[PDB]
Amino acid sequence: TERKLLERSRRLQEESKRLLDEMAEIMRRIKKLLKKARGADEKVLDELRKIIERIRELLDRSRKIHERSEEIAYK
């Protein structure tokens, strides 16, 4: 009959709509997780970058100390 099949189809459109809405939210959540992860990684790389410039500055002084030590040994 037409009425039974049409309610069958009508029930399926209700299911599809709930699924399509669910898919949409997942993509928005994925998109946000990636943006948040990128922000967090950029933060860590920002801090790693500063730690390395401190280390390298400490190696400037280390070279100065060595340089001064050779001076003292020369005479």
Binding site: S9, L12, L19, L20, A37, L48, I51, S69
Partner: protein, 78 residues
């Protein structure tokens, strides 16, 4: 500078160099802590996305089941 002064400076320089190496040792450990933090953070994010993509895939397969049933219905109602 007197000889005794130069040798004392040699000592001070050695002591200073040890303190400097220690500070670097501290900073290396801090680097490892940061590298492992980001490491775990990206792994938690990757896990969340992995399951979200799995939820997503099963929803799609079900979607195409509905679509092919729609097609079967439209054919029948003709």
């Amino acid at each position: 500078m007197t000889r005794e002064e130069l040798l004392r400076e040699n000592i001070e320089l050695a002591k200073e160099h040890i303190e400097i190496m220690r500070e670097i040792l501290e900073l290396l450990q801090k680097m490892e802590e940061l590298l492992e933090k980001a490491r775990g953070a990206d792994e938690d994010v990757a896990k969340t996305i992995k399951e979200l993509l799995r939820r997503l895939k099963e929803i799609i397969e079900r979607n195409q089941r509905i679509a092919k049933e729609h097609e079967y219905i439209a054919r029948e109602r003709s």
